Amino acid sequence: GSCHIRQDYYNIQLVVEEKTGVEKRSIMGKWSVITREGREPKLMEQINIVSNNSLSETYCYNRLNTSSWGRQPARQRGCGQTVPYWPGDNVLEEQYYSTGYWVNATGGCQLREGVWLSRKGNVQCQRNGSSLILQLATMEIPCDPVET
């Protein structure tokens, strides 16, 4: 994905084990939470590079299969919409875990069977105050009406 060299202002404090998803306090690891200035924190993979004619490292927002972590995210996003995670949801393009980081995930934009998170969709609803629009393929609507 998008890659960026470590800058001296980075304060890396959280590393996540790739397969187990164990979080630990550490400044250094294969997958570390990187917070670029102003940007939202992201779990990024340390990657070996050549740069200015020398061997070096960069940090890339690469895809990671979180299935083996055995723990659910707090939010997900896909196709230009960000939504609260509700149990029963499929895996979307990215997953936000509550300690505080986005993960580039292995899913798409199908939120439930036959139900896509699509900005051009035909159903408007909300989850815990957060608005979203769905495209449907009876069909259960996995969200609440906008009327209070």
Binding site for ligand NAG (CB under 6 A): 1, 61-63, 65, 67-68, 93-94, 104, 106, 127-128, 144
To the nearest whole angstrom, how small is the minimum distance from the Cβ of residue 97 to ligand NAG? 15
* Residues paired with 77 in a beta bridge: 82, 94
Please state whether beta strands 42-51 and 31-34 pair in parallel, antiparallel, or not at all (unpaired): antiparallel
Pick 8 or 147: Cβ nearer ligand NAG: 147
Rg (CA), the chain: 18
To the nearest whole angstrom, how small is the minimum distance from the Cβ of residue 17 to ligand NAG? 14
Pick 68 or 124: Cβ nearer ligand NAG: 68
User: How far is C-alpha 102 from the chain's CA centre?
Assistant: 4
Pick 2 or 13: Cβ nearer ligand NAG: 2
What is the residue whose two structure tokens read 């690469």? 62
